[PDB]
Design an enzyme around this catalytic site. Sequence first.
Site, PDB file in Angstrom:
ATOM      1  N   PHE A  79     -59.212 -59.239 -39.184  1.00 48.29           N
ATOM      2  CA  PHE A  79     -58.911 -58.078 -38.354  1.00 48.29           C
ATOM      3  C   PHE A  79     -60.134 -57.564 -37.614  1.00 48.29           C
ATOM      4  O   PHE A  79     -61.213 -57.456 -38.200  1.00 48.29           O
ATOM      5  CB  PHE A  79     -58.319 -56.966 -39.213  1.00 48.29           C
ATOM      6  CG  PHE A  79     -57.746 -55.837 -38.428  1.00 48.29           C
ATOM      7  CD1 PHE A  79     -56.860 -56.078 -37.390  1.00 48.29           C
ATOM      8  CD2 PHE A  79     -58.070 -54.527 -38.746  1.00 48.29           C
ATOM      9  CE1 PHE A  79     -56.316 -55.021 -36.668  1.00 48.29           C
ATOM     10  CE2 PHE A  79     -57.534 -53.471 -38.034  1.00 48.29           C
ATOM     11  CZ  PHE A  79     -56.652 -53.713 -36.993  1.00 48.29           C
ATOM     12  N   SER A 154     -60.172 -62.398 -44.965  1.00 55.23           N
ATOM     13  CA  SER A 154     -59.215 -61.284 -44.853  1.00 55.23           C
ATOM     14  C   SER A 154     -57.883 -61.792 -44.302  1.00 55.23           C
ATOM     15  O   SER A 154     -57.269 -62.658 -44.918  1.00 55.23           O
ATOM     16  CB  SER A 154     -59.793 -60.164 -43.987  1.00 55.23           C
ATOM     17  OG  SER A 154     -59.156 -58.944 -44.268  1.00 55.23           O
ATOM     18  N   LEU A 155     -57.454 -61.283 -43.144  1.00 56.17           N
ATOM     19  CA  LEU A 155     -56.289 -61.846 -42.442  1.00 56.17           C
ATOM     20  C   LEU A 155     -56.463 -63.342 -42.179  1.00 56.17           C
ATOM     21  O   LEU A 155     -55.496 -64.102 -42.158  1.00 56.17           O
ATOM     22  CB  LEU A 155     -56.030 -61.116 -41.123  1.00 56.17           C
ATOM     23  CG  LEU A 155     -55.338 -59.746 -41.163  1.00 56.17           C
ATOM     24  CD1 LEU A 155     -55.294 -59.125 -39.766  1.00 56.17           C
ATOM     25  CD2 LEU A 155     -53.937 -59.817 -41.764  1.00 56.17           C
ATOM     26  N   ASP A 178     -61.905 -62.842 -49.698  1.00 63.31           N
ATOM     27  CA  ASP A 178     -61.302 -61.514 -49.829  1.00 63.31           C
ATOM     28  C   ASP A 178     -60.050 -61.381 -48.961  1.00 63.31           C
ATOM     29  O   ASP A 178     -60.024 -60.597 -48.011  1.00 63.31           O
ATOM     30  CB  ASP A 178     -62.311 -60.406 -49.529  1.00 63.31           C
ATOM     31  CG  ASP A 178     -62.013 -59.126 -50.292  1.00 63.31           C
ATOM     32  OD1 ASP A 178     -61.759 -59.185 -51.520  1.00 63.31           O
ATOM     33  OD2 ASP A 178     -62.040 -58.054 -49.664  1.00 63.31           O
ATOM     34  N   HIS A 254     -66.098 -55.637 -48.691  1.00 66.70           N
ATOM     35  CA  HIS A 254     -65.103 -56.544 -48.139  1.00 66.70           C
ATOM     36  C   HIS A 254     -65.762 -57.712 -47.429  1.00 66.70           C
ATOM     37  O   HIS A 254     -65.277 -58.839 -47.529  1.00 66.70           O
ATOM     38  CB  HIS A 254     -64.190 -55.787 -47.177  1.00 66.70           C
ATOM     39  CG  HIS A 254     -63.091 -56.615 -46.572  1.00 66.70           C
ATOM     40  ND1 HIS A 254     -62.141 -57.272 -47.328  1.00 66.70           N
ATOM     41  CD2 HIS A 254     -62.758 -56.839 -45.281  1.00 66.70           C
ATOM     42  CE1 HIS A 254     -61.285 -57.884 -46.530  1.00 66.70           C
ATOM     43  NE2 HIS A 254     -61.636 -57.635 -45.282  1.00 66.70           N
TER      44      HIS A 254
END
Length: 435
Positions: A79, A154-155, A178, A254
């Site tokens: 993101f 992430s995404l 993550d 993150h």
Amino acid sequence: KEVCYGQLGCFSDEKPWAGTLQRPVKLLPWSPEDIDTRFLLYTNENPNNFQLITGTEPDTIEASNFQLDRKTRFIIHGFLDKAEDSWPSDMCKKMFEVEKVNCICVDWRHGSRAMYTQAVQNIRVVGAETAFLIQALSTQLGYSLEDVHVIGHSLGAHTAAEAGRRLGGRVGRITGLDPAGPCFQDEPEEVRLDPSDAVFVDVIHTDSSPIVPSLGFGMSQKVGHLDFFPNGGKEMPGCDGIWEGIGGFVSCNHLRSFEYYSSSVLNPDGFLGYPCASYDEFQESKCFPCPAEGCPKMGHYADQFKGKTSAVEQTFFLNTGESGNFTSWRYKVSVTLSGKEKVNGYIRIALYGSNENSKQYEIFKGSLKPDASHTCAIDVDFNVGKIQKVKFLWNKEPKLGASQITVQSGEDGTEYNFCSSDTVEENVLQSLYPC
Ligand SMILES: *[C@@H]1O[C@H](CO)[C@@H](O[C@@H]2O[C@H](CO)[C@@H](O[C@H]3O[C@H](CO[C@H]4O[C@H](CO)[C@@H](O)[C@H](O)[C@@H]4O)[C@@H](O)[C@H](O[C@H]4O[C@H](CO)[C@@H](O)[C@H](O)[C@@H]4O)[C@@H]3O)[C@H](O)[C@H]2NC(C)=O)[C@H](O)[C@H]1NC(C)=O
Ligand SMILES: [Ca+2]
Ligand SMILES: [Cl-]
Ligand SMILES: [Cl-]
């Protein structure tokens, strides 16, 4: 309701894509042209400036520096991120220092510059785009899907996952860094990363919380063959009222997931994971030393773990450094004291090796009686190698020393015994010798 995008096929808003508790509003992905997915190929021969390749026109590949005789790793950002002059392109650069590889960065920055629940849809299109390209490699050039590695942050991890599904989990490896929690945690395997997405799926958890209450962007849920929770998974070393989470996806914790991985490319065994159910159990030293076979190396060399795909959700906990290269090695240190009186101070110990020697570490604080044995596990930032000698130190009037010091290397299990009949005054580095 559904939309179709020519050769990328159709995408519907039926459950579990949308219209579910976790995804209430029925959204559909943007057009491929609006997401503007671009595959930037880096190579040992072109490490700094990318070559732009497409699956639609696989003459672009031939023309490029792509090599068939080389492994291929994809890097997918998440993101509100990009690949150009950022950590994906920086990661490729690390890889060229240790191996020969086709590094492909998936850049979808425009489709990631969106309201988050739109990005969660757009990823589907990005995921298709990727598989379409991965299939072209197989189809046009007979490239084996085993050699494909997809690293998503992430995404990016669920994007990775989507492409993996699109290819019936035949892709050699997925590494989820993550993986995004919001809109994936506790949801069906179709929409998230899960062990079935690739032959080998390995996940690094660094900003993990449950959905209620939300205190991070990572999944606490285990979604690989291997699941690593460095430092517990919730808060990494180095990082009432209205709670603002308005930039969680850029939280230090993150982003630490790709920092470890990048570091592991050059420092292969700086992040050894120990088989363990809970972080507390690891902290208390129940998961020590490494199993006979060996520990998995969290990060780039996780593929060398014997039995990496014998079981799903194999949990691992480790500790890392707070800054820099982030590397750390685990040690269990046992010291038993000597002297003629009980003093109220504290114990420090140093490790001396063939490579260099460590700083002093605290081991116990409070009552220091003679004959008392004290155990403590420590995080050393570098691999000391064979421990030649150790040194004991204490501080608060009378004499105090250590008669025996035992050090056990987390990595190879090796146990080192050291001895001395001496007792010293405060602050004096007593040195023990092998026995
Ligand atoms: C990535 O991570 C880390 C970066 O933070 C690196 O770890 C570092 O490794 C070095 C060894 O390679 C560690 O050891 C050095 O410091 C020790 C102890 O220092 C202590 O006493 C000093 C008092 O003057 C203080 O300055 C310190 O704060 C501390 O309390 C020294 O003993 C060494 O220097 C001397 O000794 C050896 C002889 O054995 C000689 O080689 C030297 O020439 C010198 O005479 C060490 O240089 C260092 O402490 C450690 N950092 C931390 C914070 O743990 C890691 O190596 C790095 N890179 C890699 C590849 O992983
Ligand atoms: Ca999946
Ligand atoms: Cl270049
Ligand atoms: Cl910039």
